[PDB]
Symmetry: C2
Subunit: 176 residues, 2 copies
């Protein structure tokens, strides 16, 4: 109750990163061959882990209430340094936490709800059929796979849907 809904223009913001969409997509496709997304509907893979984690690829994918603190998930996987995903992390203007690849299945949507913390999104694979829907703000948002980073305030009441035939995939960064 003490925080109120944001003004509509504060739902999103663009930070220019100049990432190459083709190289980004091919690096994600190759990575998922070796480290598959877990879960169904909304699927996930962790790109940052807690120091000394024995389950670095999936620990950070647990539901928020099982996460001690997002800020513990600081370590980019060592093997990413050599690939184009290492280049993505190098270009970030902030220190990310609990970064995950996150995906929406084809023809899938999730419940209208509020998240606890907004994140930054880099779209990997998407289409005109994949959108965020903000219910109180009556605003529809599409995040293009243009190599730029988009803040998206998913604390606001919202759903997301993917009406396409192919899965929609983002890299989703936290910050502190």
């Amino acid at each position: 109750g003490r925080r109120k809904a944001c003004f509509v223009t504060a739902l999103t913001s663009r930070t220019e990163l100049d990432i190459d969409p083709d190289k980004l997509r091919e690096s994600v496709v190759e990575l998922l061959e070796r480290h598959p997304l877990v879960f169904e509907g909304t699927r996930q893979l962790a790109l940052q882990h807690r120091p000394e984690a024995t389950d670095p690829w999936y620990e950070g994918c647990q539901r928020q209430s099982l996460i001690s603190s997002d800020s513990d998930f600081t370590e980019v996987h060592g093997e990413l340094r050599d690939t184009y995903l290492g280049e993505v992390f190098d270009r970030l203007p902030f220190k990310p936490i609990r970064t995950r690849i996150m995906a929406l299945d084809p023809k899938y949507c999730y419940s209208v709800h509020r998240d606890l913390t907004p994140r930054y999104h880099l779209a990997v694979t998407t289409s005109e059929h994949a959108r965020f829907v903000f219910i109180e703000h009556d605003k529809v948002l599409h995040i293009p796979a243009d190599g730029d980073l988009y803040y998206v305030d998913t604390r606001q009441l919202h759903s997301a849907f993917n009406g396409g035939d192919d899965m929609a995939i983002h890299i989703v960064f936290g910050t502190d």
Copy 2:
């Protein structure tokens, strides 16, 4: 095109029908026990048929390109006249055509697209997670199961999603 997008307030309109939501819902649930919805994702059952149809419960559910004319599907099924669904038809202020029960699976959405003809909607079972999303108009719409009839202009670019755990069900009426 010669027809342009409608103004945002013309996306929907309410016609008061005073139908009882509980009797409506219980009559539809019982009917679907005896006559199954066909298709997946968007599921359908026809409530009106062409004269002398051999497949009256399902001919009207074929895709629009296989429909000769919506206006041929004029006859309410005989077995409906003495149930509450017959009462619904008796109250309509227009002559309906090609009326169908239409439903969206849980966690399902369909492609962003345009339909050829707008319809009138009577929501049977729904939740806050089921919405129409108008892309060009940047408008989100919920049709409540309040016993009233809602025009929805699905000729406009749109998707629909059901983020809920249960199937969302409408009766969908055409008219001349």
